[PDB]
Design a protein around this ligand. Structure first.
Ligand SMILES: CC[C@H](C)[C@H]1C(=O)N(Cc2ccc(OC)c3ccccc23)C[C@@H]2N(C(=O)NCc3ccc(Br)cc3)CCC(=O)N12
Ligand SMILES: CC[C@H](C)[C@H]1C(=O)N(Cc2ccc(OC)c3ccccc23)C[C@@H]2N(C(=O)NCc3ccc(Br)cc3)CCC(=O)N12
Ligand SMILES: CC[C@H](C)[C@H]1C(=O)N(Cc2ccc(OC)c3ccccc23)C[C@@H]2N(C(=O)NCc3ccc(Br)cc3)CCC(=O)N12
Ligand SMILES: CC[C@H](C)[C@H]1C(=O)N(Cc2ccc(OC)c3ccccc23)C[C@@H]2N(C(=O)NCc3ccc(Br)cc3)CCC(=O)N12
Ligand SMILES: CC[C@H](C)[C@H]1C(=O)N(Cc2ccc(OC)c3ccccc23)C[C@@H]2N(C(=O)NCc3ccc(Br)cc3)CCC(=O)N12
Ligand SMILES: CC[C@H](C)[C@H]1C(=O)N(Cc2ccc(OC)c3ccccc23)C[C@@H]2N(C(=O)NCc3ccc(Br)cc3)CCC(=O)N12
Ligand SMILES: CC[C@H](C)[C@H]1C(=O)N(Cc2ccc(OC)c3ccccc23)C[C@@H]2N(C(=O)NCc3ccc(Br)cc3)CCC(=O)N12
Ligand SMILES: CC[C@H](C)[C@H]1C(=O)N(Cc2ccc(OC)c3ccccc23)C[C@@H]2N(C(=O)NCc3ccc(Br)cc3)CCC(=O)N12
Ligand SMILES: CC[C@H](C)[C@H]1C(=O)N(Cc2ccc(OC)c3ccccc23)C[C@@H]2N(C(=O)NCc3ccc(Br)cc3)CCC(=O)N12
Ligand SMILES: CC[C@H](C)[C@H]1C(=O)N(Cc2ccc(OC)c3ccccc23)C[C@@H]2N(C(=O)NCc3ccc(Br)cc3)CCC(=O)N12
Lengths: 161, 164, 164, 162, 162, 161, 163, 161, 161, 161
């Protein structure tokens, strides 16, 4: 009676390494929250080092599939697939707390196809070029919330509400 | 429990590696939904890298045995035996979300592994509506398909960004 | 879900058979017999086999209870799993289309042979094949299709969809 | 479902016998005695045997309670499992047709002292002499249900209920 | 469930290796049964190979601390600290079933000797044997029958039935 | 075992894998150079093992000129029995209590390899492909005399002649 | 020390018998064959037994070489160990006084029986006991004293010191 | 035994290829070159493949040394094993009759390495980059004669000529 | 250092006695007899005991060889170690001053058959009655060397030669 | 080994935890050095946290058994049984380097009987009373070399020769 209580506030948590199990729980919760209301916003808490790409894409696709506005909230960190989900929140509703850290850095033909899918998703949501996204994803570094805002991963850096 | 709530919505999940325990659980849930209504659609969420062939074939046969229309939904991935289950959804009701990856490549005695493989060729041909010759050739290729490629191939009917 | 299955007179023999699996299956069979000694019990079999005495424990309980027992092979019935499949009530032994059935089998020397002769006598009885044909066939490391298993006498009906 | 089994006066001696299994079975035997000290208790035995003092703990409790105890060998009763099978109330020791029964099985004096307790228990319940028990327990083999019946380990071999 | 059901009948179970968690659980159950009734008997089932000395002494001291009569019952075995607890039951109320095995032998140096002296004094008191007889006996690696334990003063009654 | 190599004795002992095969193969080539006419004695006490490793030894036996006397002691199961049967005609031996098994313990590849085994057994035993295929399905051992009748070996002997 | 033992025509069957132990013993037996056809080989047996086919490999090699083989049971000869003990040349099968000898034996159903019947035939041959006697004796889970093994036909001489 | 084998100008690429196997093979190739830069080197290949950079290390060394290199496929040459087999001096690339050959490999970096493999195979097999690419995607083995027609090897030998 | 000891006719029974320790000790006892069947052998015993049949193997071999055997207890001789200590040639069984000696120690019948063999060996070599041996072996305790001398386990306790 | 070269200079090393195998080697080395010269001093290097009591007593007894002067050298530490061996060197010949640390702190009757043997040995070599040794051995502390000198465990604290 703590995370289910959290679900009653339309809050979904993406915490820790993303794998198929984590993704499937988050996905079910998003569908639950949509049936309760297809209008009311959903808050997505993201504190994650990232994880399995297809599992991250499962969550991403579900976020887009549901009608609801999705507010994303980066707390602690959003690295790799975590930052993709952070960036995939509804335009104007992508948030970070002040000390969060954001990282977009992560057969041979397959991993390249998945990489291009990530480039395309980042391009859609950040408004940066595919050329710049590709370059940025090579760089093993974290961004500050202001840097991430400038890049287009998020809209608001908040100290208080 | 949220997975019990899913079952109340006529949603069944095939997620992670498929083995006998996953199969028997999914099989049990399919019968339950048929008992509640033999007409109402069942939604099958498929996010799986595949698994044990006989366990997947067990789910496959049960899908064909029950009376219900089964809507299959590929999210994340459907690889190997997962893509067979995806392809075995009711005609017109086989779905993928836009960024899913689909693999039909398949990554006991010699005779038996071949007998099973030949069963897979027959099932894929039947459900894709393609010739078995095309299926057998295509299954050698170690690669994934996009949802649009999988639609073209006859593995699925619809690629949906959101509901229509 | 398996408790809810038990309310519908369904018992599941799933995965490797051992003493714990056997005792649960046995307990469930007695439960269903107490609720009604007339009404059929459905035995779901998806098993690679397992411990011989534990399989024989289930076999004896199946024979001991009064009820008709419908056996259903989905996925596979191998080793002791196929014995249980064959031990269903005559006319009520089923397989789904893609199941694999194996009668081949994967303490002192005399004891292993005594157990093997008990298996021969059970297979000979329920399949109607001679002791020599059972003995020769159990030597062959191979699976049978459901139609081959029907022909052999391990089961009665191969069903893609229900009759009614 | 094991709760409901107990409600039907069924106690299970299943798998390797150790102190935890014994003390559970023992607790259950006292439970069924309190509910009714006259109604029969059914003891399901499918065991390869196990720890001798744990098995003797069960045995002593079976004799201690006033209830008639029906023993049922299904699958197998080996070593201490066969002792418990033999310890059922006379006339009420049963096996199903394909079961296998075996009577073959610290300081050296203690193991031998424990072994002599087993000989006396088998001799008592089988009606066999101490020598034929000793000689038979040396033979590494199983008996059929009919052989065990002839030996005095059990009373009835049943294909179906009477 | 079955062990909490046992506790409703004023039965406490000392099962298996005695450690601090087993002792503390047994100790809590003893205090519970005392508050329910400080005059009614508590039954203490003992089937144990022994265990930690301080854990056994924790149980022993609590047995003396509570006002209730404590019936000790040895089933299977009571070895090492388990036989100490068996002997610590109320005079006249220390029991064993017929095939139980009882052992008083124990299987910084000054500290292990100090503990041993405490064990000698406790055994001496409850068995009415001298310290020298207790010392010599505890050196011998052997088990006693229930009748042997009875004549030594470890228990009072060897019961086949109630 | 090094002293055995001085007597033109090679040992196929235990489970056959790539490392076992490579050692046997080098020893076989060594004994060819010392004398490509003198017989080589192959001790076989093996439950079988890796099929390609077994085929590596088989091919090397056929590749070298030398007569190869095969000796089944204890057992020759699976690839071990193939190696036993691949000895020079008239020079394939078993001791009296040995056990011989021809049964074996992508999908297309395992069938391709199995067909290769059928062709080798049929060649060296003079049995048809159907007889080999049926026999390899039976999970049983043959006595040395049965193996002799089948064409796996030539002589079953208690002492040296 | 073990190479020095090999120079004295002494082969050691020690511990659990597996394919590695058998092949070493077999190879050592062939070394001593080449040194002399006539000279006795001494087989030290201190073993709980082991893998049946490995034991039969040793047995067959013992019979195959022409040499007389003196078997010496010290510590124990159990299961396949006792078979090898009994397989020594007639008159030359020895035990020291405190050794224990067990013929009891603590793959498919047909094969285990085929192997067991081979063991019965070997024991019957070397002990001169009937098949029916070997069968019932191998069911009894027990050891024999060196004297009891002597009267059974497993060994010839129980000796405290040399003669 | 392998030390004595080196005296005959034989190097063994056996088991899974890693950095340690590569470094030993590489060191043996340099030794044989200093003993004689004219004399042929025989390369025994019985390998399921392994680490790509380790295989390329061996490959580059084979091209670097002056000597003709006879490659010998016994058992199998899969993945990087088949590349080394194909990299033998033209006319000197051999397989025994029952060997199996596979060029199939079982984010931006792995793509670059994959293209390097395509270029190496194309050079040594005389197949186009598209034929190599399509072939390496297919999970299957070739018989020695199939590998011969593809351009991986020159001679399928039963015995020496 | 260990072969140096063996040239001085010193055999060491160190640590837990198993079949491996016994067979080495037994082999060394034969070696020293062949060198000289009348020259004393020194047996160093520092052992907590071990496998009964392995200890009896050593015991029987000590009785079998012709040589005088000097036993030397240093550190400890417990269980089967003390039997071997007691089994030295009369007059030649030694302990250093601070050693600890313990005589306290398959089917139920067999374990009891083996215990009777131990009782009779101890009875023989200590000259104590069977009552005394059986009662003493029940007691879980150690003897000092003087107690052990008094008991008949050894002859001399010496601080120096 | 360099420890063999040390042995030619009559140096024996008691290093690391003392067990039966460490003790048995030290003991064999002590007998060797005595046979080379029964009058020349032996140097015992002690850098040990202690270990098994009976193994320490085995070394102690052997030190007393041999005729030689034994110089003990504490370097690093001599704790528990190590300090007993240090104290057991020939009077006047027990040494420590300046930064070493020395500690004498460590069935029921049997471990107490062993404890009494230790008290008697420490009393003998330190000249402290039995009650002082008893008391001191309860105290969980290390001594400096000068404190160990005052206690009677060693004679000389040397910075250099
Ligand atoms: C927008 C949802 C759609 C309108 C539609 C649909 O396409 N699905 C398929 C689907 C299933 C499982 C999945 O991951 C677990 C899916 C993930 C992503 C996309 C589709 C997934 C079932 C869903 N249901 C549905 O949403 N109940 C409401 C509900 C769900 C979960 C819980 Br817990 C509680 C209530 C049934 C009726 C219904 O109409 N739908
Ligand atoms: C189309 C189903 C049929 C109408 C029929 C049938 O053939 N079975 C056999 C069967 C058993 C177990 C299996 O996997 C566990 C099976 C899997 C595949 C196919 C058959 C399986 C039992 C089923 N039941 C039935 O439908 N309960 C309703 C129900 C089931 C589960 C749950 Br939870 C709740 C209700 C009893 C009456 C009844 O007639 N049937
Ligand atoms: C056909 C059952 C018989 C009519 C008969 C019987 O011979 N038994 C022995 C028996 C016990 C345990 C076993 O495996 C756990 C047995 C396995 C195989 C064979 C016998 C077994 C007890 C059973 N009971 C009985 O069946 N309750 C009804 C019931 C059982 C289980 C559950 Br859960 C719920 C109700 C009491 C009355 C009663 O008379 N019987
Ligand atoms: C014929 C029983 C006797 C009349 C007597 C008795 O001697 N005991 C001691 C005892 C305790 C625990 C044991 O193993 C766990 C024992 C094992 C074997 C023998 C005795 C054991 C407690 C029992 N009680 C008793 O039977 N409760 C009823 C009851 C028991 C268990 C459960 Br769960 C529920 C109710 C209290 C009244 C009562 O007087 N008794
Ligand atoms: C004879 C008990 C005394 C009358 C007294 C007492 O000295 N204690 C201390 C004590 C606490 C915990 C211990 O092991 C867990 C103790 C073990 C041994 C000895 C004392 C222990 C608390 C106890 N209480 C008490 O007895 N509750 C009743 C009760 C206890 C447990 C449970 Br569950 C339910 C009820 C409170 C009132 C009360 O006054 N007492
Ligand atoms: C009939 C042998 C041929 C005449 C020829 C040959 O085809 N090879 C290739 C080859 C190498 C390695 C292999 O597995 C390790 C091979 C396995 C199977 C087949 C070929 C193998 C090397 C051999 N050599 C050769 O045999 N030395 C003699 C020799 C070998 C080993 C040792 Br150690 C000592 C001497 C060099 C001269 C020479 O020309 N050859
Ligand atoms: C009585 C031996 C025979 C006369 C004959 C023979 O049949 N073999 C086959 C054979 C090989 C390996 C085996 O287990 C490793 C065998 C085991 C059992 C039976 C045969 C075995 C080789 C042996 N050789 C032979 O004995 N070298 C002498 C020798 C052996 C080992 C060592 Br080390 C040193 C010299 C070479 C030529 C020679 O004449 N023989
Ligand atoms: C064709 C070799 C060249 C002539 C040249 C050379 O470029 N190297 C660099 C080099 C080092 C290590 C490597 O893998 C371990 C290399 C691998 C690939 C390429 C270069 C490697 C050292 C070599 N040496 C040389 O080859 N001795 C002969 C030799 C080497 C090894 C052994 Br073992 C025995 C003799 C010193 C003299 C000498 O001039 N060279
Ligand atoms: C008193 C010894 C006897 C005179 C006689 C004998 O009965 N044996 C059998 C035997 C073998 C192995 C055993 O444990 C390894 C035995 C253990 C206990 C008893 C017998 C054992 C071989 C021994 N040998 C012999 O004396 N070598 C001398 C020797 C032994 C080892 C080493 Br290393 C070096 C030389 C050969 C000739 C010879 O005549 N004998
Ligand atoms: C002072 C030694 C004595 C003079 C005497 C003796 O009592 N022993 C028994 C003994 C053996 C083994 C032991 O731990 C391994 C012992 C440990 C402690 C005490 C005795 C031990 C054998 C020794 N030897 C002897 O010392 N060789 C010289 C030597 C020893 C070892 C090496 Br390496 C090289 C030479 C034979 C002649 C000889 O007479 N002695």
């Amino acid at each position: 009676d703590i995370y289910s209580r959290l679900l009653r506030e339309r809050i979904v948590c993406v915490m820790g390494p993303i794998d198929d199990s984590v993704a499937s729980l988050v996905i079910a919760q998003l569908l639950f929250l949509q049936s309760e209301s297809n209008k009311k916003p959903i808050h997505m808490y993201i504190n994650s080092p990232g994880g399995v790409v297809t599992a991250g894409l499962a969550i991403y696709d579900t976020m887009q599939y549901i009608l609801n506005p999705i507010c994303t909230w980066c707390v602690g960190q959003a690295a790799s697939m975590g930052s993709l989900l952070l960036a995939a929140g509804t335009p104007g509703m992508r948030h970070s707390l002040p000390n969060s850290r954001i990282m977009i850095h992560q057969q041979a033909e397959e991993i390249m196809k998945l990489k291009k899918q990530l480039y395309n998703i980042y391009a859609k949501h950040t408004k940066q070029s595919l050329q710049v996204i590709e370059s940025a994803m090579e760089r093993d570094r974290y961004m500050s919330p202001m840097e991430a805002q400038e890049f287009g991963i998020l809209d608001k850096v908040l100290v208080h509400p």
